[PDB]
Structures are given as structure tokens and as C-alpha cells.
Amino acid sequence: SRPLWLPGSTPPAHLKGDLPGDFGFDPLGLGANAESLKWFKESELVHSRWAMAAVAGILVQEIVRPDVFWYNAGKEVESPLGPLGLLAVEFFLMHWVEVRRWQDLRKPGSVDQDPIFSQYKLPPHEVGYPGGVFAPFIPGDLAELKVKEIKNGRLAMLAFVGFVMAAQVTGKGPIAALQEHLADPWGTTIFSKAAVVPGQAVAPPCKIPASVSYKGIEIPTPCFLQGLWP
Amino acid sequence: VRPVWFPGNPPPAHLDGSLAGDYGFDPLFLGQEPQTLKWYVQAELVHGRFAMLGAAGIILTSIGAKVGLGFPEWYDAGKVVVEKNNIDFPTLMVIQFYLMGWAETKRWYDFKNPGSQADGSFLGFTEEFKGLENGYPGGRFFDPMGLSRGDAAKYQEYKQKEVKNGRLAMIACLGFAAQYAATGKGPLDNLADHLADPNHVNFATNGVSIPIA
Amino acid sequence: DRKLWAPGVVAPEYLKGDLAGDYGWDPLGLGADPTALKWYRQSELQHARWAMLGVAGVLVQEIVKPDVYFYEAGLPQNLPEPFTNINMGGLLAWEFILMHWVEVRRWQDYKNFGSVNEDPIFKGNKVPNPEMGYPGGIFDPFGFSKGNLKELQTKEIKNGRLAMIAYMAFILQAQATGKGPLAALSAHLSNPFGNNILKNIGTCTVPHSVDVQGLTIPLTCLWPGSQ
Numbered sequence: 001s002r003p004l005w006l007p008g009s010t011p012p013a014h015l016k017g018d019l020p021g022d023f024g025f026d027p028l029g030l031g032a033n034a035e036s037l038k039w040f041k042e043s044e045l046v047h048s049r050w051a052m053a054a055v056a057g058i059l060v061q062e063i064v065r066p067d068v069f070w071y072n073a074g075k076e077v078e079s080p081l082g083p084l085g086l087l088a089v090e091f092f093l094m095h096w097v098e099v100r101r102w103q104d105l106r107k108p109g110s111v112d113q114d115p116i117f118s119q120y121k122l123p124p125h126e127v128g129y130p131g132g133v134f135a136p137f138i139p140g141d142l143a144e145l146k147v148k149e150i151k152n153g154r155l156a157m158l159a160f161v162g163f164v165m166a167a168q169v170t171g172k173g174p175i176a177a178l179q180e181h182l183a184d185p186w187g188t189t190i191f192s193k194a195a196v197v198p199g200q201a202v203a204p205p206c207k208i209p210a211s212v213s214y215k216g217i218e219i220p221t222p223c224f225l226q227g228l229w230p
Numbered sequence: 231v232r233p234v235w236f237p238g239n240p241p242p243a244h245l246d247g248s249l250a251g252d253y254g255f256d257p258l259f260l261g262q263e264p265q266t267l268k269w270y271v272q273a274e275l276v277h278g279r280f281a282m283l284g285a286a287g288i289i290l291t292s293i294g295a296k297v298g299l300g301f302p303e304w305y306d307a308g309k310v311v312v313e314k315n316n317i318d319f320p321t322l323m324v325i326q327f328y329l330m331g332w333a334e335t336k337r338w339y340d341f342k343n344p345g346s347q348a349d350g351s352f353l354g355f356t357e358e359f360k361g362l363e364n365g366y367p368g369g370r371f372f373d374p375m376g377l378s379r380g381d382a383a384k385y386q387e388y389k390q391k392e393v394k395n396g397r398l399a400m401i402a403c404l405g406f407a408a409q410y411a412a413t414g415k416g417p418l419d420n421l422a423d424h425l426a427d428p429n430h431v432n433f434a435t436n437g438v439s440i441p442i443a
Numbered sequence: 444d445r446k447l448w449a450p451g452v453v454a455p456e457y458l459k460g461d462l463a464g465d466y467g468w469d470p471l472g473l474g475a476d477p478t479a480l481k482w483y484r485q486s487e488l489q490h491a492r493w494a495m496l497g498v499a500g501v502l503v504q505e506i507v508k509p510d511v512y513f514y515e516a517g518l519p520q521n522l523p524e525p526f527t528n529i530n531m532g533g534l535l536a537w538e539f540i541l542m543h544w545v546e547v548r549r550w551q552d553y554k555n556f557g558s559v560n561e562d563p564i565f566k567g568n569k570v571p572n573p574e575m576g577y578p579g580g581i582f583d584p585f586g587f588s589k590g591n592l593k594e595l596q597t598k599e600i601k602n603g604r605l606a607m608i609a610y611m612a613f614i615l616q617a618q619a620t621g622k623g624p625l626a627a628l629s630a631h632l633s634n635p636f637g638n639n640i641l642k643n644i645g646t647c648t649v650p651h652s653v654d655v656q657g658l659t660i661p662l663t664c665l666w667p668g669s670q
């Protein structure tokens with residue numbers, strides 16, 4: 001009745017199309033339990049929203065600041081606030097924001113009131129979709145917008161993982177890697193730099209240094225599951 | 231009706247197919263008594279679950295050794311970890327038995343008196359230790375994703391999958407030990423040799439398994 | 444009343460001439476399960492159709508390019524000038540992506556008949572797909588399906604079955620004699636008695652392994668022939 005990930009298939013019973021982006025994909029049945037789906041619904045939005053912001057940032061960094069490698073931005077960046085000064089602000093600010101979001105997930109409608117200012121309050125909303133101050137402007141229908149958000153978000157989540165493995169294998173940024181593909185599309189695919197057959201296995205070398213020296217300490221920098229690479 | 235380990239042989243009376251992975255294999259009638267069968271059903275799962283962790287760990291580290299990442303073989307990891315990290319073996323052993331003793335004693339008295347560990351005695355937890363079946367704790371701690379609380383049909387399918395991968399893992403862990411004793415090389419070192427010349431490199435030619443060879 | 448594979452042999456119950464090219468031949472009784480018979484019928488069509496392309500390719504390629512020795516044609520250095528020494532990794536990438544799409548579409552048709560007839564991108568386009576394994580429509584531009592379809596199915600399977608046998612003759616002959624199909628045929632005509640299977644059967648001419656752009660590929664003959 002609705003488009004599915006695999007056309008012609010029957011969606012699992014626990015999936016019925018109520019949620020946005022519900023295309024009936026759940027081969028392992030992780031969403032069968034009602035409470036588990038409610039939690040997994042929140043994490044998908046949060047993961048997607050973080051990924052979209054992260055993917056956009058990495059692309060903008062390369063265009064604006066081509067010299068700096070987004071992978072090495074952790075050590076490359078220098079600021080007066082120092083390493084632990086930045087971390088301290090980040091921890092406390094994130095702890096407040098995340099706990100309040102977490103509380104609404106458990107008991108919705110309890111953390112809508114603004115603590116400091118009495119008059120301001122968050123209108124009634126659904127879990128994971130705060131309204132009011134967070135949404136000053138809405139281009140159009142929310143139902144359509146929610147589908148747009150998740151579909152772009154899901155793509156972004158894959159996009160970021162593409163950056164990491166491309167960065168670890170090719171040792172380059174996202175746009176820089178793409179330019180390499182366009183130069184020699186046949187000789188740059190993962191098939192054209194790695195292969196495993198009975199009796200032999202060839203894998204790309206991890207182009208990220210094993211360890212990083214950062215202000216008198218050594219930070220391990222391992223390639224993700226480098227032993228299982230093709 | 232249902233398949234059995236020895237086609238054509240009727241299954242034993244005490245094995246009625248209700249349990250997961252039941253193929254009517256009990257030639258020595260070790261589980262004829264119903265109460266003793268409960269004990270062995272859980273013993274098999276604990277053996278199978280540990281073997282799966284052991285086999286996966288041995289395989290993964292062996293891949294690390296072959297690829298050159300520097301992992302030691304499973305039969306040398308214990309010595310390497312202790313020496314490299316400067317760990318007192320007797321202290322590490324004692325810590326293990328405190329943590330295993332506490333966790334495994336709780337599993338022991340849940341078998342004797344089911345539901346006894348969910349009385350709130352342990353830090354006030356009253357529902358995470360209740361238990362679903364014999365050998366299947368369930369709950370939001372041991373089953374955080376609630377795959378045992380969703381579809382009933384698929385949960386029974388997983389029980390079939392768990393036991394058979396567990397039995398396969400148990401056999402594999404015996405293979406690792408037997409192969410090391412006969413060959414003295416790592417798991418994947420043996421696999422590489424077999425793929426090189428399968429005809430002339432196997433157990434029938436190692437000079438140990440078949441002494442009359 | 445149809446003729447059977449052997450004289451005076453009773454055909455299996457489930458083989459009653461419904462399918463094309465039905466001689467009632469199933470010594471292993473693999474078609475007893477009705478669902479299994481459907482799947483095996485599809486694989487027979489796949490082997491039949493792929494094999495016919497394989498036989499045609501080998502024979503035509505031999506005529507146009509006698510020296511390529513199709514058995515070795517897979518090596519990159521033997522490819523035509525435009526594609527000579529192409530990166531096999533990239534070349535495989537095209538096939539995997541394109542074949543994965545096409546074959547999953549065919550597979551989904553078997554799982555749920557008639558579900559994947561319509562074009563996914565351009566709405567409206569469809570194929571008739573009168574029977575499983577016979578999409579028709581765009582796959583039949585000349586419209587030969589119209590008419591005596593049953594007879595055409597019989598002709599397809601009979602020729603396809605012959606191709607399967609014929610192609611594996613090419614492979615074993617190349618392994619034993621080291622020559623292509625036409626080349627081996629000429630050799631037999633020159634010296635029918637001296638040059639035949641009785642002499643060549645004992646030798647396997649395939650090297651143990653080859654190096655394809657730095658990757659070692661194992662190779663084998665279909666029997667333990669004297670290397």
C-alpha cells in the first residue's frame with residue numbers, strides 16, 4: 001500500500017507506516033517490542049541530526065579551509081581556552097541539554113517549563129519533536145517535513161561513515177577523495193585496491209598514524225577494525 | 231515427524247521436541263529424569279554461550295596475528311598480557327572468582343527457587359532478575375533490546391539459532407585445542423596450510439592423528 | 444502419450460507434461476516437492492540461457508579472433524586494445540553492481556510473482572510476464588511470444604539443454620588438449636585415430652595458478668589429470 005525498501009515484500013507486523021520514514025525495513029525485528037521502538041525512534045533522530053550537522057561541517061571545512069584535514073582537526077586546532085578548558089564547558093553544557101531531552105523521553109511534558117523564566121513554556125508536542133522556540137519557522141506541512149528530515153538524515157549517517165573509512169584508507173578529505181575517483185574511476189574503487197581470494201588476501205594500508213603526540217601525551221589513533229578490512 | 235540425529239530411529243520418550251535444538255540425541259539416557267534434564271539444558275546453554283565468546287575471540291585475534299597487527303596466538307595471549315601490562319596473576323584470578331562467584335551464584339539459586347533473585351534484595355532491583363524460562367533470563371538487563379519480548383514466533387526461532395551456533399562453537403573450541411596439540415600452530419595458520427595444498431596437508435598427513443599412516 | 448527418455452519406463456506422477464521439454468526424467472526424484480520443482484525449473488532456464496550465450500560466444504569469438512584461446516581470454520593482457528590491461532578491480536565493480544540489481548529483480552519475481560513487473564523510475568511501464576521465467580514485453584520486442592508459445596518453449600529448452608552439454612565439452616577439451624572447440628575439431632579430422640580422447644584424457648594443460656595484476660588466482664582441472 002506504501003513504498004517499501006524491497007518492493008513486493010510484506011512489511012513486518014510491528015511496522016505499519018505510522019512513523020515517518022517507515023518503509024517496512026526491519027529484518028532482525030529489533031522494533032517488535034513497543035517500548036524498544038519508542039527508544040530506538042529517539043536515537044535514530046538524534047543520530048541523524050548529529051550526522052547531518054557533522055557531514056555539512058566537514059564539507060564546509062574543506063572548502064573554506066582546504067589545508068586542514070578534518071580527521072586531524074582535533075590536534076590541529078589551537079585556541080586560548082586550552083584542551084581541558086574546552087572540555088569542561090562542553091561537558092556541563094551537554095550534560096544539562098541531554099538530561100532534559102532524556103527526561104522528556106521518559107515522562108513527556110514534565111520538562112517543557114522554562115526553569116528561570118516562568119512565563120515562557122514549550123507548547124504540547126511529541127517526543128523527539130519539540131516545538132515553540134525550537135521551531136520559529138516551518139516551511140510547510142510537518143508530515144512532509146518529517147519524512148524529508150529522516151530521509152536526508154539517514155543518507156547523512158551513511159555519508160559520515162563513508163568519510164571515516166575513506167579518510168582511513170585514502171588518507172584524504174571527502175571532496176579530495178571524490179576528485180581522485182573522477183580522475184581514475186576504474187583504478188580507485190575499493191575493488192581496485194583490495195581483494196581476498198582463497199590463499200591470498202590484500203588489504204589497503206592504514207594511512208592514519210598509529211599514535212598522535214598532542215601536548216606531551218600520546219593519543220592512540222587506530223584504524224577502525226583494520227584487521228577485518230577486505 | 232521431526233528430524234532426528236539418526237534417521238529411522240524413533241526419538242527417546244523423554245525428548246519430545248519442546249526444547250530448542252532437540253534432535254532426540256541421548257544414546258546414554260543421561261537426561262531421562264525430568265529434573266536432571268533441566269539442569270543439563272542450562273548447562274548446555276552456558277557451555278555453548280561461553281564457547282561462542284571463546285571461538286569469536288580466538289578467531290578475531292588470529293586474524294590480527296596473520297595480518298601482522300601484532301596479536302599473539304590464543305595459546306600465548308595469557309602470558310603476553312600479564313607480562314606486558316605488569317599484572318599479578320593471582321590477584322587477577324581472585325578478582326575473577328569474586329565477580330563470577332557473585333554472578334553465577336545468583337544464577338544458581340534462581341534455578342533452585344525461580345524468581346527468588348527478583349525480590350528486591352540486590353540493590354532494590356526487582357524485575358531485571360526475575361527470569362523468563364530455564365536458561366533464558368530475559369529482562370531489560372540481559373535482553374536490553376527486548377527481542378524476547380517482541381514477536382513470539384521469531385523468539386522461538388532465535389532459540390533454535392542460539393543452541394546450534396553454540397554447539398558448533400563448542401566443537402570448534404575442541405578443534406582449536408586438538409589442532410594446536412597435533413600441529414603446534416595457530417588456528418588460521420592451519421587454515422592457510424590446508425588451502426595451499428588441501429590434498430597433502432590435513433590431519434591424515436600430520437603424522438599424529440593417524441599413527442599407522 | 445508423450446515419448447519418454449527411455450523405452451518402457453514409467454514417468455513420475457508429478458511430471459505430467461505441463462512443462463516444456465518434459466520427458467519424465469527424474470531418477471533422483473528432486474522434483475517431488477512442488478515448490479522445489481519451480482526453483483529448479485528457473486535454474487534450468489538460467490543455465491540453459493547462459494550456456495547458449497556461452498557456446499555462441501566461444502564459437503563466434505574463435506572465428507573472428509582465432510588466436511585468443513577463449514580459455515585464456517579472461518586475462519587482462521589479452522583484452523581488446525581499448526580495454527587492454529584494464530584494472531580488473533574496477534571492471535568487476537561494474538558487473539557486481541549491475542548484476543546485483545538485475546538478479547535481485549528476477550529473484551523478487553520468483554518470491555512474489557508479478558510484484559516487480561512495473562518500472563520503478565518511470566511509472567506506467569510494465570511487462571506482461573505471462574509465466575515465471577518468461578518476462579515478455581520489452582524482453583520480447585519482436586513479439587514471437589504471440590502464437591504457439593508452448594512450441595517455442597520446447598525449442599528453447601531443448602536447444603538450451605544441448606548447449607549446456609556442448610559448453611562443458613569445450614571446457615574439458617580445452618583442459619585436456621589445450622585447444623578451442625573448432626581447433627580440436629580440426630585436429631581430430633587430420634588424425635582421427637592418433638588424436639582422440641583415448642590419448643589426451645591423461646593430461647591437464649591448465650597451470651596451477653596465474654598472476655592477475657599481482658593477485659594469485661588458483662586454477663584446477665575437473666579431474667586429477669597429469670599436470
Ligand code: CHL
Pocket residue numbers: 198513514515516517518519531534535538653655660661662663664
Ligand atoms: C561464466 C563465468 C565465467 C567462467 C565460466 C569463467 C571461466 C574461466 N575464467 Mg574467467 N570466467 C567467468 C567469468 C569471469 N572471468 C573473469 C576474469 C578471469 C580472469 C582474470 C581469469 C579467468 C580465468 C578463468 C578460468 C578459471 C579456471 C578456474 O578453475 O577458475 C575457478 C577458480 C576459482 C578459485 C573460483 C571457483 C569458484 C567460483 C567459480 C567462484 C565463486 C566466488 C564467490 C562468488 C565468492 C563469494 C564470497 C563470499 C564470502 C560472499 C576459466 C577459463 C583464468 C584463466 O584464464 O586461466 C587460464 C584467469 O586468469 N577469468 C571475470 C572478470 C571480468 C569474470 C566475470 O564474470
Ligand code: CHL
Pocket residue numbers: 070071072073074075076083086087090091208212214219220221222
Ligand atoms: C563526536 C566526537 C568526536 C569524534 C568522533 C572525534 C574523532 C576524532 N578525533 Mg576528536 N573526536 C571527537 C570529539 C573530540 N575530539 C577532540 C580532541 C581530539 C584530539 C586532541 C585528537 C582527536 C583526534 C580524533 C581522531 C582519532 C581519535 C581516536 O582514534 O581516538 C581513539 C580513542 C580515544 C583517544 C578515546 C575515546 C573516548 C571515547 C570514545 C568516549 C569517552 C567518553 C567520556 C569518558 C565521557 C565524558 C566526556 C564528555 C564530553 C561526554 C578522530 C577523527 C585525534 C586526531 O586528530 O587523530 C588524527 C587527536 O589527536 N580529537 C575534542 C576536544 C576535547 C573533542 C570534543 O568533543
Ligand code: CHL
Pocket residue numbers: 327328329330331332335336339351352
Ligand atoms: C553471615 C554471613 C554471610 C555469608 C556467609 C554470606 C554469603 C553470601 N552472600 Mg550474603 N552472606 C552473609 C550475610 C549477608 N548476606 C546478605 C545479603 C546478600 C545478598 C542480597 C546476596 C548475598 C549473596 C551472598 C553470596 C555471595 C557469593 C560470592 O561469590 O560473593 C562474592 C563476594 C563479593 C563480590 C563481595 C566481596 C568482595 C571482597 C571480599 C570485598 C572487597 C571490598 C572492596 C571495597 C572492593 C573495592 C573494589 C573497587 C574499588 C574496584 C554468598 C553465599 C549473593 C548471592 O549469591 O545471592 C544468591 C546475593 O545476591 N548476600 C546480608 C544482608 C541481609 C547479610 C547479612 O548479614
Ligand code: CLA
Pocket residue numbers: 050053054056057058060061064065068073074076077079
Ligand atoms: C557537529 C558539529 C560540528 C563540530 C563538532 C565541529 C567542529 C569543528 N569545526 Mg566545524 N562546522 C560545522 C559543524 C561542526 N564543526 C558546521 C555545521 C559548519 C557549517 C556552518 C561548520 C563550519 C566550520 C568552519 C568554517 C570551521 C569549522 C572548524 C571546526 C573546528 C574548530 C571549531 C572552533 O574553533 O570553534 C570556535 C567556536 C566559535 C568561534 C563559536 C561557535 C558558536 C556556534 C556557531 C554556536 C552554534 C549553536 C547551535 C545551537 C548549534 C546547533 C547544531 C549542533 C547541535 C550540531 C572543529 C574541529 C574550523 C576548522 O576547520 O578548524 C581547523 C573552521 O574553520 N567548522
Ligand code: CLA
Pocket residue numbers: 640641642644645646666667668669
Ligand atoms: C575405471 C576406470 C578408470 C580408473 C579408475 C582409472 C584411473 C586412473 N587412470 Mg585411467 N583410463 C581408463 C579407466 C580408468 N582409469 C580408461 C577406460 C582409459 C582409456 C580412455 C584410461 C586412460 C588413462 C590415461 C591415458 C591415463 C590414465 C590415468 C589414470 C590415473 C588418473 C589420472 C588421469 O589423468 O586419469 C585420466 C583418466 C580418465 C579420465 C578415465 C576415466 C574413466 C571413467 C572413470 C570410466 C568410464 C569411461 C567411459 C567408458 C568412457 C571412455 C572413453 C570414451 C571415449 C569411450 C588413475 C590411476 C593417468 C595415468 O596413467 O597417470 C599415471 C593417465 O595418464 N587413464
Ligand SMILES: CC(/C=C/C=C(C)/C=C/[C@@]12O[C@]1(C)C[C@@H](O)CC2(C)C)=C\C=C\C=C(C)\C=C\C=C(C)\C=C\[C@@]12O[C@]1(C)C[C@@H](O)CC2(C)C
Pocket residue numbers: 255256257258259260277278280281283284285287288303304305306307308400401403404
Ligand atoms: C566439546 C564440548 C562438549 C561435547 C559433548 C558431547 C559431544 C556430549 C555428548 C553426549 O552427551 C550427549 C549430548 C548425550 C549422551 O547421551 C551421549 C554423549 C555422547 C555422552 C564442549 C566444549 C566446550 C568448550 C568451551 C566452554 C570453551 C570455552 C573457551 C573459552 C572461554 C576460551 C577462552 C580463551 O580463548 C580466549 C577467547 C582467548 C585465549 O587467549 C584465552 C582463552 C582463555 C583460552
Ligand SMILES: CC(/C=C/C=C(C)/C=C/[C@@]12O[C@]1(C)C[C@@H](O)CC2(C)C)=C\C=C\C=C(C)\C=C\C=C(C)\C=C\[C@@]12O[C@]1(C)C[C@@H](O)CC2(C)C
Pocket residue numbers: 468469470471472473489490491493494496497498499500501504513514516517607608610611
Ligand atoms: C551456464 C553454463 C555456461 C556458461 C558459460 C559462459 C557464460 C561462458 C562465458 C565465456 O565463455 C565466453 C563466452 C568467452 C570466454 O572468453 C570467457 C567466458 C566467461 C568463459 C553451463 C551450464 C552447464 C550445465 C550442465 C552441464 C548441467 C547438467 C545437468 C545435468 C545433466 C543434470 C541431470 C540430473 O539432474 C537431472 C536433470 C534430474 C535428476 O533426477 C538426475 C540428474 C542426472 C542428477
